[PDB]
Design an enzyme around this catalytic site. Structure first.
Site, PDB file in Angstrom:
ATOM      1  N   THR A   1      13.697  -2.251  17.426  1.00 54.29           N
ATOM      2  CA  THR A   1      14.448  -2.988  16.374  1.00 54.29           C
ATOM      3  C   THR A   1      13.525  -3.993  15.677  1.00 54.29           C
ATOM      4  O   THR A   1      12.670  -4.582  16.365  1.00 54.29           O
ATOM      5  CB  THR A   1      15.657  -3.727  16.960  1.00 54.29           C
ATOM      6  OG1 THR A   1      16.623  -2.755  17.357  1.00 54.29           O
ATOM      7  CG2 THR A   1      16.273  -4.703  15.983  1.00 54.29           C
ATOM      8  N   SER A   2      13.695  -4.159  14.361  1.00 53.28           N
ATOM      9  CA  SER A   2      13.073  -5.225  13.529  1.00 53.28           C
ATOM     10  C   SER A   2      14.158  -5.900  12.681  1.00 53.28           C
ATOM     11  O   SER A   2      14.769  -5.205  11.842  1.00 53.28           O
ATOM     12  CB  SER A   2      11.973  -4.680  12.661  1.00 53.28           C
ATOM     13  OG  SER A   2      11.120  -3.828  13.403  1.00 53.28           O
TER      14      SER A   2
ATOM     15  N   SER B   1      11.848  -5.793  18.793  1.00 55.80           N
ATOM     16  CA  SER B   1      10.544  -5.239  19.248  1.00 55.80           C
ATOM     17  C   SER B   1       9.494  -5.300  18.132  1.00 55.80           C
ATOM     18  O   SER B   1       8.333  -5.641  18.434  1.00 55.80           O
ATOM     19  CB  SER B   1      10.717  -3.829  19.742  1.00 55.80           C
ATOM     20  OG  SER B   1      11.294  -3.012  18.734  1.00 55.80           O
ATOM     21  N   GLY B   2       9.888  -4.977  16.895  1.00 55.25           N
ATOM     22  CA  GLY B   2       8.979  -4.860  15.739  1.00 55.25           C
ATOM     23  C   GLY B   2       8.574  -6.204  15.156  1.00 55.25           C
ATOM     24  O   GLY B   2       7.685  -6.211  14.284  1.00 55.25           O
TER      25      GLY B   2
END
Ligand SMILES: [Cl-]
Ligand SMILES: [Cl-]
Ligand SMILES: [Mg+2]
Ligand SMILES: [Mg+2]
Ligand SMILES: [Mg+2]
Ligand SMILES: [Mg+2]
Lengths: 222, 204, 125, 195, 211, 196, 233, 221, 5, 195, 196, 5
Positions: free
Chosen positions: F1-2, F129-130
């Site tokens: 995810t970002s 995460s991104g």
């Protein structure tokens, strides 16, 4: 995983005379290889001429002393300000310790004072409340160093009368408050030399019929 | 299953005025079971004395090994090995087994025949030398021995006085350990005489 | 739960519910106990207004609590069954823990204790 | 606890139970009776975890004795066995299950027939002509398969039982210090003193 | 190491006085016999705290019995209170090995073995502790029903001494008790330090040891 | 995810990718990670989809019941309700939530709530995460009191890089604009943002 | 059972003649990531106490709320809430020490190391430590985490025992604290340059200093260090 | 606790004298300063046997190398030989060394870790009390230290360990390696932990100990 | 720890 | 393998060794001789891991017999015991050590003295008046401490040994099927057939 | 660790931080992570210090022996020797190495060698724990055929952000310039790069 | 064990 226990090091020592009793303990508080405090007292006057120390995990030690001090207070309220005898205190502490048999207080407990005949008394407890009256007991990190020295010097163990062909034992006798404090000071200086968790300061609490006196002595700070 | 505390036992060595004392218990057990009350842990190669605590099979093995090496030493050198030299030989031999060590706590004691200087030394199981003026301790009651020695010991004791100190140090230490005791032996070593005394101690 | 204090004191210092429970006993069929030199005999009245009865299956007036103790009663028949059941359970419980059958005094003391408990417990008569 | 056997013959049930109580490397007792009388014509032998065995046996005994007093009537061996099985069937899904295996030897007075029930700690009940719990079965079952007949007398049953004990004493690793034998028939329960 | 055996003259009870924490000898002056009442004795083996706490608790339950029932509790009833207690704690990690020895009129002299995994056994001879096997070795090989009070007291003492010697975790001193129809009688504290040599010299035994 | 939330002159803008993954498989390539807890209080969901959905639904329920009694809640109040759930149930939750709302008094506000259940009020927040790959970029490029068009470019360029490097991030770039004007939804497709 | 997520590093403190000094950097670390840079880890309670907290920040924010609520609760039905019956450092500490031990005893600890620095009503200096285990101790110098290993040695050179406290001025004491914060920035991998410092004096009261920076740093010698042994370039 | 400090015309290494087995002090005054060569000295922390063994082995090979090459040995030779030996054993030889000395190239100060990683510096500290020592070094170190200043800083860094670290204690050993001069090994440079007079003499009356047997032991041939 | 004959 | 005892008396060494060979829940054999004659005046009893015991015993036997042929001379019990200990001392640090415990009962013809050596699988040698391996010791040592005298005859030694076997048969959990007794004296090795 | 190598007009520039850590303790704050394997072939070391030092020493030995026989080796040849050690001993090594050299024919070349022991020739390479935070920044800001001053600013700004976010990175920013002119060492202190 | 500043 969270470990609820810790080792705060230090060592304690209780000797009983004829008309007095001493409870000594070093003032060093540690965790791992760090010194937390050079003067953190763990020998306490609990009232009714009872001195107490719960050495090991300081958090459990403080909690126990706190609960016993409170136990003495409520004993006065419930029994018309009656003096809690050392033998009664000892049994009460057994129930405090065994109360948490399945989540133990990680401490070696020693109480000192006078019995109901006015004679010096020392009681020692394991972590789960097994207790025993003795003339002599060392507890904590340097117990293994000090205790055999006490057996030899207080109870005259392995000492025979010269020239009696090891047939007549050295006779048992009560030590003077002067001779006892000498043994305590030599015990702690010896323990300080060879144990890393023992040092900084020595605090002795002496219990006579007159009350509770204190003495403090410097120990090596390395 | 801790090799150093299966059989049990203790050795202690002290220095005096122009003399050294080395002492040991006689117990050999298998954990709780006491087996032998004659198992001596002090050996000697000429005038050099070696006391070994720990796993009994290694105590016996190392005695036989150091007898082997000191015998060849004497034949080639045409003289008895000295305590300082023997200490180095023990250290060499133990570290040779660095990653498969003998589970022992050896103690060298003796008087250098040339200088007449009292000498004692202790080792870990991988041969680290621990030299001392005062005393060396070893075994399952090392904590007890450290406490006794540190309090009782004083420098420049006469052979007769030194005997009483080392004996009381061993006896009281052995009585606070379950795996030690069952009789003790004390060697008093002067320049050119050695007295060996068996102590009376509680048999439990 | 039903909490009402049914058994309570009156101005003259009487618990009427306990005294009215005695009136129920006084209504009940007569029961007699006579102990001899080497025996006890429990006699019990059965009212004769009930003909066409089946005496094989009709609950007997004397009940065995254990193999060595018996209990007869006067008053409410339904109430007696609850005391007899409790007594029989306590009889087996005593054998299990003490490794010995109850004494007649102990069994009595228990039953009497149960009867007392219902005279100062809330929600019960 | 280890060896408990049971043999149903023509007119009786015979239960044999080892006398040894072992803890560690010590035989603490060599005269232990591993049985309780549930009723005058019903006997239950038991083996398994220390403490659980006696605690369970006595608990069942108390319940059957309570029933006998309440109804002034003896429960059939089938009825008792069904009660015991349900207690173990409850137990196995408890916080701490009873680790107890039982044989129930009883004489049904209404049918005039002996009955032997084998119930394990899971609550697994079977009616058998002969039964055993633990390692005993691995020897005795094949032996009884050969020598057992359904029309045998009590005396023939005891000789058949002696043949089992002899085989166990020969080939079993542990010393179980012989067996206490008890007979259940129309006249109730009695113990064979000389075995 | 603790033992109690039944004979012609009543019950003999002998215990050592040693308490250990691992290989560390913590004490050599411990009471392992609890005096519940003049006709009841309790032995202690296992966790010091568990035995000490629950056997003094048992003494309170035995007192409440004779208050309620106006009669001294039976050895069977006393032992079963303790066995039913430890059984409630089964699996919790209680470590106790005890023997309830006493005299009553209905029972006579009685010994009950009670351990922490709920085992309760009536018997004539029991040895409990780390050195129970060493005690058994001497006791069994010398035991007869027709022993005198003097010989029985000695055998009980000698059996502890045997275990005190061989077992590393047994020693300190021997505490003797003799239970009769009149109640228990204390027969003194005997230090192994002096007793061993006294026995060795007088008996001529312990030839394994350097005299 | 970002995911990220940026505060500017006229209010706040919420930005997120559209990729939900199971291992290295993309379960949903058109996910909406921007969710409404109130008319002008929205949140960005990262961590366990199941956990973040459960929390968001409860917060929406709480702020709806709050509004019925005490009128419109503050963005701080919304962040407090999120924190209370995330902190008190920290042992059983995997939820990294960015709370972003527009008041008329307080203007655009952004609160970030990491795994622990701690609250941090920031001028802009990045999470998922991104986010790791754009700490350097976002720090260097962010300015306070940006315009709407500048903030949209900042978020687009940022999530473009996050998506490019993070395998767990991709699909479309969704954005939600919170101002006095109202609520505006924006979408940006690979063919545009990939070649930035 | 917990694991700490967002964490604060060393809190350092020491006594001087008239009061106590306490300091802590403004960093909220997320493992190796230096995530949050505007985190205040010194929280004043009244005008006579400062609670310095290290460890988990979510649990720190919970403790903030408890202390905030304690001030409110003390004010209830208390005309002397800003006088004789005001919150003492000893009252605030004992409350926290009770909570920390109660939480460890329920196997659900507040993952923190706390130092309560303040001045009592009678003018006595108060400085005491408590952590997730409920372990409490007092000393002329107290520090948490890396502070315990690096700061204490430096602070103890100034105040080695009780008798050194009257001889130590606020100028000397603060200098030692600021020096210790620089050493921690050199050597602690989860420390920041920005920190807060608080002085509680019995005369001048509470002085709270924000946005302090480590300065006068030695980095010049680095240029001369080439390779890891044999390299000459 | 062991440290190394560089000054204008050489390098100085210092170490404490405490040896521990678990929490017990085995040796109150052991020597952690090792002579690799006459003007290359080494300070070791970690497994006592490993530090002594590895320093002696390289010291032996350095001596043979010095005789072979007809040259005074270099610190980089000792450094290279130590790190390649330690690396080969993948950290199983628990030797943490501060290698210092003077050679024809000049004065040098290095640290070696058990796994075989080497570091260069003007001030270094290794062992359990390294953080207590490094705190002092970071506080008081400066460029262009004199001989007397470097000894003071080095001993102060060890003292920090002695007092604050439970792992370290007793005395301070120092070795000064100055260019153009013989290296001076200052055994027990400071002794700030002297044992106070005992309250009582525990000299027993002769005949206190009970004896079973006496015998003369034959040590002669 | 606790003491354990 | 389980029970091996040894008693040195005035003029002989007596070795008692259990006859039971158990694998799982089956006693495979009840007549197993757990001993090998190393030389005319040296006997070695052995107990431990299955296979290792006999393999080790026979290996030692072959080596001592090889020596006897080579030198035309019998090795002293002390010399044999030292050889055996070294083999076990080597073994314990091998890839797969011999898990074998041995008693070596021998009569030294030069000294005219009986000698009993107890060696465990670690290579731990002790000369004893009486010895045992495994759980046997926990009963027999305390028993012998009491009843043993150094000046006892072979017949007194056998009665002392009977007292040990009786105690083991009473208190040992496992059935070890009695013992084979062998006497080592000046006249060599002989077996007691009726025990 | 934060390290990178950037190729520009006149050759290549190597950049690194100076922080070596044991857990959260900084063992060395003035580390030299840029090491010479040949006159104009240098490498950037990340991972286990012990492993990277061992590899670098062997490569230097190999390229010295290569030079004695076959004259100056190519940057590709140096990267091949690194790969051979890293690949064949992948089970026992933790080494992320960037090889950067200047030929006169091939000009500035950068080869990156991750944990696996794979070789990747790139226009610029980033590696070490702190590289994660500057993937977004470096990708957006890097241009081919930059000037010396532009490349120094690119590396300085990049490692500045890497150091700011990564706890495992810090101290001074060391740089080594490889051109036809020769070898130039550069150092940049916190007081400069922190406030970029 | 083994001795280990
Ligand atoms: Cl979703
Ligand atoms: Cl490096
Ligand atoms: Mg000290
Ligand atoms: Mg002993
Ligand atoms: Mg013993
Ligand atoms: Mg950084």
């Amino acid at each position: 995983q969270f470990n609820p226990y810790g080792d705060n090091g230090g060592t304690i020592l209780g000797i009983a005379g004829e008309d007095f009793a001493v409870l000594a303990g070093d003032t060093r508080n540690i965790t791992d290889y760090s010194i937390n405090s050079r003067y953190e007292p763990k020998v306490f006057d609990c009232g009714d001429n009872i001195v107490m120390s719960a050495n090991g995990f300081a958090a459990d030690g403080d909690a126990l002393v706190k609960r016993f001090k409170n136990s003495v207070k409520w004993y006065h309220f419930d029994h018309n300000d009656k003096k809690l005898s050392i033998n009664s205190a000892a049994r009460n502490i057994q129930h405090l310790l065994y109360g948490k048999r399945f989540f133990p207080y990680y401490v070696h407990t020693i109480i000192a004072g006078l019995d109901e005949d006015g004679k010096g008394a020392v009681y020692s407890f394991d972590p789960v409340g097994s207790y025993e009256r003795e003339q002599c007991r060392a507890g904590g990190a340097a117990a293994s160093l000090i205790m055999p020295f006490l057996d030899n010097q207080v109870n005259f163990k392995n000492q025979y009368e010269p020239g009696t062909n090891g047939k007549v034992k050295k006779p048992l006798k009560y030590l003077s408050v002067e001779e006892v404090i000498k043994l305590v000071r030599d015990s702690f200086t010896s323990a300080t030399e060879r144990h890393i968790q023992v040092g900084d300061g020595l605090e002795i609490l002496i219990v006579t019929k007159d009350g509770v006196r204190k003495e403090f002595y410097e120990l090596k700070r390395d | 299953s801790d090799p150093s505390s299966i059989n049990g036992g203790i050795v202690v060595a002290m220095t005096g005025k122009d003399c050294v004392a080395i002492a040991c218990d006689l117990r050999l057990g298998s954990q709780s079971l006491g087996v032998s009350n004659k198992f001596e842990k002090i050996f000697h190669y000429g005038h050099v004395f070696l006391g070994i605590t720990g796993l009994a099979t290694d105590v016996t093995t190392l005695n036989e090994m150091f007898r082997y090496k000191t015998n060849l030493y004497k034949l080639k050198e045409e003289r008895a090995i000295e305590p300082e030299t023997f200490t180095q030989l023990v250290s060499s031999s133990l570290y040779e087994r660095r990653f498969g060590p003998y589970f022992v706590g050896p103690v060298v004691a003796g008087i250098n025949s040339k200088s007449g200087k009292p000498f004692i030394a202790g080792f870990d199981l991988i041969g680290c030398i621990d030299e001392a003026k005062d005393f060396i301790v070893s075994g399952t009651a090392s904590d007890q021995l450290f406490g006794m020695c540190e309090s009782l010991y004083e420098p420049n004791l006469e052979p007769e006085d030194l005997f009483e100190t080392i004996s009381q140090a061993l006896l009281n230490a052995a009585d606070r350990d379950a795996l030690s005791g069952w009789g003790a032996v004390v060697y008093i070593i002067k320049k050119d005489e050695v007295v060996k005394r068996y102590l009376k101690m509680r048999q439990d | 739960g039903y909490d009402r204090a049914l058994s309570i004191f009156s101005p003259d210092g009487h618990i009427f519910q306990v005294e009215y429970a005695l009136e129920a006993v006084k209504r009940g069929t007569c029961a007699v106990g006579v102990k001899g030199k080497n025996c006890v005999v429990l006699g019990c009245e059965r009212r004769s207004t009930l003909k066409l009865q089946d005496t094989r299956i009709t609950p007997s007036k004397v009940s065995k609590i254990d193999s060595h103790v018996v209990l007869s009663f006067s008053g409410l028949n339904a109430d007696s069954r609850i005391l007899i059941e409790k007594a029989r359970v306590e009889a087996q419980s005593h054998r299990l823990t003490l490794e010995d059958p109850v004494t007649v005094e102990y069994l009595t003391r228990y039953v009497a204790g149960v009867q007392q408990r219902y005279t100062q417990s809330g929600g019960v008569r | 606890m280890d060896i408990i056997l049971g043999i149903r013959v023509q007119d009786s049930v015979i239960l044999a139970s080892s006398k040894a109580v072992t803890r560690g490397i010590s035989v603490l007792k060599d005269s232990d009776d591993k049985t309780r009388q549930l009723s005058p014509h019903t006997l239950m032998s038991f083996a398994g975890e220390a403490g659980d065995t006696v605690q369970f046996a006595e608990y069942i005994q108390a319940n059957i004795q309570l029933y006998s007093i309440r109804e002034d009537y003896e429960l059939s061996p089938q009825a008792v066995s069904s009660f015991v099985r349900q207690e173990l069937a409850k137990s196995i899904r408890s916080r701490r299950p009873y680790q107890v295996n039982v044989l129930i030897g009883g004489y049904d007075k209404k049918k005039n027939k002996p009955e032997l029930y084998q119930i394990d700690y899971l609550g697994t009940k079977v009616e058998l002509p002969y039964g055993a719990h633990g390692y005993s079965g691995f020897y005795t079952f094949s032996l009884l398969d050969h020598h057992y007949r359904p029309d045998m007398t009590t005396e023939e049953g005891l000789d058949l039982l002696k043949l089992c004990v002899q085989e166990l004493e020969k080939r079993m690793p542990m010393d179980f210090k012989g067996v206490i034998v008890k007979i259940v028939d129309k006249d109730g329960i009695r113990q064979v003193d000389d075995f | 190491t603790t033992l109690a055996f039944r004979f012609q003259g009543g019950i003999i009870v002998a215990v050592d006085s040693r308490a250990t924490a691992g290989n560390w000898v913590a004490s050599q002056t411990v009471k392992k016999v609890i005096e519940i009442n003049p006709f009841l004795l309790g032995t202690m083996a296992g966790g010091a705290a568990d035995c000490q706490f629950w056997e003094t608790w048992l003494g309170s339950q035995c007192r409440l019995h004779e208050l309620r029932e106006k009669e001294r509790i039976s050895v069977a009833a006393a032992s079963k209170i303790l066995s039913n207690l430890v059984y409630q704690y089964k699996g919790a990690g209680l470590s106790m090995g005890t023997m309830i020895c006493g005299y009553t009129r209905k029972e006579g002299p009685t010994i009950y073995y009670v351990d922490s995994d709920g085992t309760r056994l009536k018997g004539d001879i029991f040895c409990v502790g780390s050195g129970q096997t060493f005690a058994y070795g001497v006791l069994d090989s010398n035991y007869k029903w027709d022993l005198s009070v003097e010989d029985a007291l000695y055998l009980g003492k000698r059996s502890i001494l045997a275990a005190a010697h061989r077992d590393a975790y047994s020693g300190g001193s021997v505490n003797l008790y003799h239970v009769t129809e009149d109640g228990w009688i204390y027969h003194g504290n005997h230090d192994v330090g002096e007793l061993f040599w006294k026995v060795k010299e007088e008996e001529g035994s312990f030839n394994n040891v350097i005299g | 995810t970002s995911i990220m939330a940026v505060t500017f002159k006229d209010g706040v803008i919420l930005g997120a990718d559209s990729r939900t993954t199971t291992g290295a498989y993309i379960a949903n390539r058109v996910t909406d990670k921007l969710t409404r807890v109130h008319d002008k209080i929205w949140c960005c969901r990262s961590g366990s989809a199941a956990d973040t959905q459960a929390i968001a639904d409860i917060v929406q329920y709480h702020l709806e019941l709050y509004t019925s009694q005490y009128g419109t809640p503050s963005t701080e109040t919304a962040a407090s309700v999120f924190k209370e759930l995330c902190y008190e149930n920290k042992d059983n939750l995997t939820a990294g939530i960015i709370v972003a709302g527009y008041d008329d008094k307080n203007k655009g506000e952004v609160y970030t709530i990491p795994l622990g259940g701690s609250v941090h009020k920031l001028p802009y927040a990045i999470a998922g995460s991104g986010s790791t790959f754009i700490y350097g970029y976002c720090d260097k490029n962010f300015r306070e009191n940006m315009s709407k068009e500048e903030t949209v470019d900042f978020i687009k360029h940022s999530l473009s890089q996050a998506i490019k490097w993070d395998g767990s991030s991709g699909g479309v770039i969704r954005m939600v604009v919170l101002t006095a004007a109202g609520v505006e939804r924006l979408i940006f497709y690979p063919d545009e943002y990939e070649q930035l | 059972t917990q694991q700490p997520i967002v964490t604060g590093t060393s809190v350092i403190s020491m006594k001087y003649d008239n009061g106590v000094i306490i300091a802590a950097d403004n960093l909220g670390s997320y493992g190796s990531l230096l995530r949050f840079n505007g985190v205040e880890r010194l929280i004043p309670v009244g005008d006579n106490t400062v609670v310095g907290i290290s460890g988990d920040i979510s649990d720190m924010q919970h403790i903030e709320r408890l202390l905030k609520d304690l001030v409110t609760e003390n004010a209830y039905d208390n005309p002397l809430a800003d006088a004789e019956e005001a919150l003492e450092p000893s009252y605030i500490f004992e409350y926290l020490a009770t909570v920390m031990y109660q939480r460890r005893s329920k196997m659900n600890p507040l993952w923190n190391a706390i130092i309560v620095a303040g001045v009592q009503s009678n003018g006595d200096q108060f400085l005491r430590y408590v952590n997730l285990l409920g372990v409490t101790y007092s000393s002329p110098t107290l520090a948490t985490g890396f502070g315990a290993h690096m700061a204490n040695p430096l602070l103890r050179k100034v105040v080695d025992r009780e008798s050194d406290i009257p001889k130590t001025t606020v100028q000397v004491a603060e200098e030692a604290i600021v020096n210790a914060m620089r050493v921690l920035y050199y050597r602690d991998a989860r420390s920041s340059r920005n920190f807060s410092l608080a002085i509680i004096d019995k005369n001048t009261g509470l002085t709270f200093k924000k946005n302090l920076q480590v300065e006068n740093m030695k980095w010049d010698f680095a240029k001369d260090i080439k390779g890891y042994g044999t390299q000459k370039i | 606790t062991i440290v190394g400090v560089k000054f204008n015309n050489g390098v100085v290494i210092a170490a404490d004298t405490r040896s521990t087995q678990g929490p017990i002090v085995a040796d109150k005054n052991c020597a952690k300063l090792h002579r690799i060569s006459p003007k290359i000295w080494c300070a070791g922390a970690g497994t006592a046997a490993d530090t002594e063994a590895v320093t002696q082995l390289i010291g032996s090979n350095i001596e043979l190398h010095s005789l072979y090459t007809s040259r005074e040995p270099r610190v980089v030779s000792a450094l290279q030989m130590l790190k390649q030996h330690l690396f080969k054993y993948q950290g199983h030889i628990g030797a943490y060394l501060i290698v210092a000395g003077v050679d024809p190239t000049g004065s040098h100060l290095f640290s070696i870790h058990a796994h075989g990683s080497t570091d260069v510096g003007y001030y270094l500290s290794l062992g359990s009390g390294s953080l207590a020592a490094m705190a002092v070094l970071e506080s008081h170190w400066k460029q262009d230290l004199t001989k007397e200043e470097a000894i003071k800083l080095a001993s102060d860094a060890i003292q920090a360990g002695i007092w604050n670290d439970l792992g370290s204690g007793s005395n301070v050993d120092v070795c000064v390696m100055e260019i153009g001069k013989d290296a001076e090994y200052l055994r027990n440079y400071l002794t700030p932990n002297v044992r106070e007079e005992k309250q009582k003499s525990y000299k027993f009356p002769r005949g206190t100990t009970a004896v079973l047997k006496e015998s003369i032991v034959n040590i002669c041939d | 720890x606790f003491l354990x004959x």
